[PDB]
Amino acid sequence: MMLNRIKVVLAEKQRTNRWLAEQMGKSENTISRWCSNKSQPSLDMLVKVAELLNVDPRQLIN
Amino acid sequence: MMLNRIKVVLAEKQRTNRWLAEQMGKSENTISRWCSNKSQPSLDMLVKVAELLNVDPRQLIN
Protein backbone atom coordinates (compact mmCIF):
# COMPACT_ATOMS: atom_id res chain seq x y z
CA MET A 1 0.00 0.00 0.00
CA MET A 2 0.99 3.61 -0.70
CA LEU A 3 -0.77 6.72 0.50
CA ASN A 4 -0.05 10.41 0.57
CA ARG A 5 0.87 12.81 3.39
CA ILE A 6 -0.68 15.93 1.92
CA LYS A 7 -2.98 16.53 4.90
CA VAL A 8 -0.11 16.44 7.42
CA VAL A 9 2.21 18.58 5.31
CA LEU A 10 -0.55 21.17 4.64
CA ALA A 11 -1.00 21.52 8.40
CA GLU A 12 2.75 21.72 9.07
CA LYS A 13 3.13 24.40 6.39
CA GLN A 14 0.08 26.37 7.68
CA ARG A 15 -1.87 26.12 4.38
CA THR A 16 -5.48 25.15 3.66
CA ASN A 17 -7.17 22.81 1.19
CA ARG A 18 -8.75 25.90 -0.46
CA TRP A 19 -5.38 27.53 -0.99
CA LEU A 20 -3.88 24.40 -2.51
CA ALA A 21 -6.88 23.85 -4.81
CA GLU A 22 -6.68 27.47 -6.00
CA GLN A 23 -2.93 27.19 -6.70
CA MET A 24 -3.41 24.01 -8.68
CA GLY A 25 -6.54 24.95 -10.60
CA LYS A 26 -8.41 22.01 -9.06
CA SER A 27 -11.66 21.74 -7.10
CA GLU A 28 -11.47 21.88 -3.31
CA ASN A 29 -13.29 18.52 -3.34
CA THR A 30 -10.42 16.94 -5.31
CA ILE A 31 -7.83 18.22 -2.78
CA SER A 32 -9.99 17.16 0.16
CA ARG A 33 -10.20 13.63 -1.29
CA TRP A 34 -6.42 13.51 -1.64
CA CYS A 35 -6.12 14.76 1.97
CA SER A 36 -8.40 12.02 3.27
CA ASN A 37 -6.64 9.46 1.02
CA LYS A 38 -9.98 8.66 -0.68
CA SER A 39 -8.32 9.38 -4.02
CA GLN A 40 -4.74 10.01 -5.12
CA PRO A 41 -2.76 12.54 -7.18
CA SER A 42 -0.70 11.47 -10.20
CA LEU A 43 3.09 11.64 -9.71
CA ASP A 44 3.32 14.93 -11.66
CA MET A 45 0.56 16.48 -9.53
CA LEU A 46 2.43 15.35 -6.41
CA VAL A 47 5.53 17.17 -7.68
CA LYS A 48 3.50 20.39 -8.16
CA VAL A 49 2.01 20.08 -4.66
CA ALA A 50 5.53 19.62 -3.25
CA GLU A 51 6.79 22.70 -5.13
CA LEU A 52 3.88 24.75 -3.72
CA LEU A 53 4.51 23.54 -0.14
CA ASN A 54 8.31 23.91 -0.46
CA VAL A 55 9.04 20.27 0.36
CA ASP A 56 10.75 17.34 -1.39
CA PRO A 57 7.99 15.36 -3.14
CA ARG A 58 9.22 12.22 -1.29
CA GLN A 59 7.81 13.85 1.86
CA LEU A 60 4.30 13.64 0.40
CA ILE A 61 4.35 9.83 0.13
CA ASN A 62 3.62 7.30 2.88
CA MET B 1 11.19 16.06 -10.05
CA MET B 2 9.67 12.58 -9.73
CA LEU B 3 9.27 10.01 -12.47
CA ASN B 4 8.33 6.38 -12.69
CA ARG B 5 10.37 3.24 -13.41
CA ILE B 6 7.60 1.21 -15.01
CA LYS B 7 9.47 0.71 -18.29
CA VAL B 8 12.57 -0.70 -16.57
CA VAL B 9 10.61 -2.94 -14.21
CA LEU B 10 8.40 -4.27 -17.05
CA ALA B 11 11.57 -5.31 -18.89
CA GLU B 12 13.14 -6.85 -15.79
CA LYS B 13 9.96 -8.82 -15.10
CA GLN B 14 9.65 -9.94 -18.76
CA ARG B 15 6.20 -8.33 -19.29
CA THR B 16 4.87 -6.11 -22.08
CA ASN B 17 2.93 -2.85 -22.19
CA ARG B 18 0.00 -4.79 -23.74
CA TRP B 19 -0.08 -7.26 -20.87
CA LEU B 20 -0.04 -4.52 -18.26
CA ALA B 21 -2.76 -2.52 -20.02
CA GLU B 22 -4.96 -5.64 -20.24
CA GLN B 23 -4.46 -6.43 -16.53
CA MET B 24 -5.36 -2.90 -15.53
CA GLY B 25 -8.27 -2.31 -17.89
CA LYS B 26 -6.44 0.64 -19.46
CA SER B 27 -5.48 1.48 -23.05
CA GLU B 28 -2.04 0.43 -24.26
CA ASN B 29 -1.48 4.11 -25.13
CA THR B 30 -1.96 5.08 -21.46
CA ILE B 31 0.63 2.49 -20.32
CA SER B 32 3.04 3.49 -23.08
CA ARG B 33 2.81 7.13 -21.95
CA TRP B 34 3.57 6.10 -18.37
CA CYS B 35 6.52 4.03 -19.67
CA SER B 36 7.96 6.99 -21.58
CA ASN B 37 7.23 9.28 -18.59
CA LYS B 38 5.03 11.48 -20.83
CA SER B 39 2.23 11.05 -18.29
CA GLN B 40 2.01 9.57 -14.80
CA PRO B 41 -0.12 7.08 -12.85
CA SER B 42 -1.94 8.08 -9.66
CA LEU B 43 -0.50 6.60 -6.45
CA ASP B 44 -3.27 3.94 -6.29
CA MET B 45 -2.60 2.93 -9.91
CA LEU B 46 1.10 2.64 -9.08
CA VAL B 47 0.22 0.27 -6.23
CA LYS B 48 -1.82 -1.93 -8.63
CA VAL B 49 1.05 -1.97 -11.16
CA ALA B 50 3.44 -3.00 -8.37
CA GLU B 51 1.09 -5.81 -7.27
CA LEU B 52 0.90 -7.07 -10.88
CA LEU B 53 4.71 -6.98 -11.31
CA ASN B 54 5.35 -8.48 -7.84
CA VAL B 55 7.47 -5.56 -6.64
CA ASP B 56 7.30 -3.02 -3.79
CA PRO B 57 5.60 0.09 -5.21
CA ARG B 58 8.62 2.16 -4.04
CA GLN B 59 10.56 0.39 -6.81
CA LEU B 60 8.34 2.05 -9.42
CA ILE B 61 9.33 5.59 -8.41
CA ASN B 62 12.44 7.52 -9.47
Side-chain angles (χ1 to χ4, degrees):
Chain A
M1 166 137 299
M2 171 168 57
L3 301 168
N4 77 73
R5 303 186 65 248
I6 294 166
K7 191 185 67 81
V8 171
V9 178
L10 279 171
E12 286 179 346
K13 294 306 200 160
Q14 296 185 30
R15 293 293 201 180
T16 58
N17 286 358
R18 178 229 268 167
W19 178 84
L20 181 59
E22 287 175 349
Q23 294 296 306
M24 291 179 80
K26 300 205 176 283
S27 69
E28 193 178 352
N29 185 56
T30 296
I31 298 308
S32 75
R33 286 176 63 81
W34 295 351
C35 281
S36 67
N37 278 287
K38 297 192 198 194
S39 71
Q40 301 296 341
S42 69
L43 297 182
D44 57 297
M45 294 173 202
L46 204 66
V47 171
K48 222 302 196 78
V49 175
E51 286 166 354
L52 289 170
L53 298 175
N54 300 318
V55 299
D56 191 308
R58 84 180 120 63
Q59 312 286 48
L60 299 181
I61 297 185
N62 179 25
Chain B
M1 166 137 299
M2 171 168 57
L3 301 168
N4 77 73
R5 303 186 65 248
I6 294 166
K7 191 185 67 81
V8 171
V9 178
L10 279 171
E12 286 179 346
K13 294 306 200 160
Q14 296 185 30
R15 293 293 201 180
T16 58
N17 286 358
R18 178 229 268 167
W19 178 84
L20 181 59
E22 287 175 349
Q23 294 296 306
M24 291 179 80
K26 300 205 176 283
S27 69
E28 193 178 352
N29 185 56
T30 296
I31 298 308
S32 75
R33 286 176 63 81
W34 295 351
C35 281
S36 67
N37 278 287
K38 297 192 198 194
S39 71
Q40 301 296 341
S42 69
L43 297 182
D44 57 297
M45 294 173 202
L46 204 66
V47 171
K48 222 302 196 78
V49 175
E51 286 166 354
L52 289 170
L53 298 175
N54 300 318
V55 299
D56 191 308
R58 84 180 120 63
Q59 312 286 48
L60 299 181
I61 297 185
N62 179 25

